[PDB]
């Protein structure tokens, strides 16, 4: 015959070896693939979709779960008051878990790209005012007050003019490794922060509700990426 020497790894089964195997049904002609709308090809398509960010992830009472989707603003809040705050940690617990992006980050170990949060005011049409939305890069501590946050990368939002506004998070990178307990977790540290302060108070004419809610929607830019498939889940197929 033809001279050969078998090399180590012969007869082994690698769960990730993508070789070919013998077709059980050689003659079978599987029913032809026809056209179906919205085919997905690469998960990052999904990551660029706006999902509702449960910033108000505080109520747990079963019947108030719908409340996590929206946080509110009211007349009672005085100028300068801090409305709300959260981090730019897509994969870690908290707000991002609600977004689709967040859930997909979970099947991966590393990632990086620019994010993008959009805020939607759902209050009465007659209401007006200004909100200051500031981003404090990783490391920078949550600004003491409105004015100090006013010096950072911020955006004055007048929902009297535009009902929507989108903020871009320049960058977030879950790359810095951590071996705490005895379980190694490739964690953030890049917990960028997004604060939101009442630049002015909530103003309304008689006849309009003195409270309104807002909805956070997030997605990642086209420069987003992920690495290291890592299947992990609390939800599994029950016996």
């Amino acid at each position: 015959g033809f001279p050969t020497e078998l090399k180590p790894g012969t007869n082994q089964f690698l769960t990730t070896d993508d070789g070919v195997s013998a077709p059980i049904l050689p003659n079978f002609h599987p029913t032809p693939c026809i056209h179906i709308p919205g085919e997905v090809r690469n998960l990052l398509e999904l990551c660029q979709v706006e999902t509702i960010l449960e910033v108000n992830n505080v109520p747990t009472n079963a019947t108030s779960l719908m409340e996590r989707l929206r946080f509110p603003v009211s007349a009672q809040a005085g100028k300068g008051e801090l409305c709300a705050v959260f981090r730019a940690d897509p994969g870690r617990n908290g707000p991002w878990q609600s977004t689709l992006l967040g859930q997909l980050c979970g099947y991966y170990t590393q990632w990086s790209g620019s994010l993008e949060v959009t805020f939607m005011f759902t209050g009465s049409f007659m209401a007006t005012g200004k909100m200051l939305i500031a981003y404090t890069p990783p490391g920078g501590p949550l600004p003491k007050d409105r004015a100090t946050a006013m010096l950072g990368t911020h955006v004055i939002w007048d929902f009297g003019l535009q009902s929507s506004v989108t903020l871009v998070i320049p960058w977030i990178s879950n790359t810095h490794y951590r071996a705490h307990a005895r379980d190694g977790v490739f964690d953030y540290y890049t917990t960028g922060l997004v604060s939101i302060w009442y630049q002015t108070n909530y103003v309304v004419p008689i006849g309009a509700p003195n409270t309104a809610y807002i909805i956070a929607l997030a997605a990642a830019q086209k420069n987003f990426t992920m690495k290291l498939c890592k299947d992990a889940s609390d939800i599994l197929q029950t016996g």
Binding site: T16, D18, E39, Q97, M226, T238
Partner: protein
């Protein structure tokens, strides 16, 4: 700069464990030295939720068989793995004539011989396997039942007229290949209760993710 890992195929590759057959000598479990395993890709826990991200899918499966005694030992015993396509009759006994029906692909291998491995095509008579079906097949118990999603059955048994001399354990791995998916949908956020429907616990309805004290504290 590359995004090869975030592709469908990349996401669904890897041969996972989806089945495990027990063929004890003395036992309540599979007393006739044989077993029938209808192909369930949910066999790998993590799987269900991953696929249930899409409404429709299509793919081929590469099956690899790992057999040994409970302590993971290797012994001189020959085995028959029979694949009964959907529509074909599974063996009711250790001597059912199904074992000899040519139209049921079968493969033989010694425990010593390395893993058995074969590819199985996209069976379904439909254009795609569909994880969700909002109807019934021409209050009911036939709701959400898309049967045309059957891949077939795998019948395993010791070769020979007589019971095997050793207690055996077969493990079935399955790598999904050539995957195509359509219509993406919300990631299951509640615990699964049944293999058939999406029913959940209406008392234990938990918030998608970790909660906190105030919306002003981190």
């Amino acid at each position: 700069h590359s995004t090869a890992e975030t592709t469908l195929d990349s996401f669904f590759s890897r041969a996972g464990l989806v089945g495990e057959i027990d063929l004890p000598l003395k036992g309540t479990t599979n007393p006739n030295g044989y077993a029938n395993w209808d192909i369930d890709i949910t066999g790998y826990a993590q799987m269900r939720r991953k696929v249930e991200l899409f409404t429709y899918m299509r793919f081929d499966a590469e099956f690899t068989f790992v057999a040994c005694t409970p302590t993971g030992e290797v012994v001189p015993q020959l085995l028959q793995y029979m694949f009964v396509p959907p529509g074909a009759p599974k063996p009711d006994s250790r001597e059912s004539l199904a074992w000899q029906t040519a139209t049921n692909p079968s493969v033989f291998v010694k425990l010593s011989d390395p893993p058995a491995q074969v590819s199985v095509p996209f069976m379904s008579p439909a254009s795609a396997y569909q994880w969700f079906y909002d109807g019934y097949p021409t209050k009911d118990l036939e709701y959400g039942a898309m049967p045309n999603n059957m891949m077939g059955t795998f019948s395993v048994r010791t070769v020979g007229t007589s019971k095997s001399k050793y207690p055996l354990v077969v493990r079935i791995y399955m790598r999904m290949k050539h995957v195509r998916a359509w219509i993406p949908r919300p990631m299951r956020n509640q615990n699964y209760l049944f293999k058939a429907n999406p029913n959940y616990a209406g008392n234990s309805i938990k918030p998608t993710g970790a909660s906190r004290t105030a919306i002003t504290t981190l």
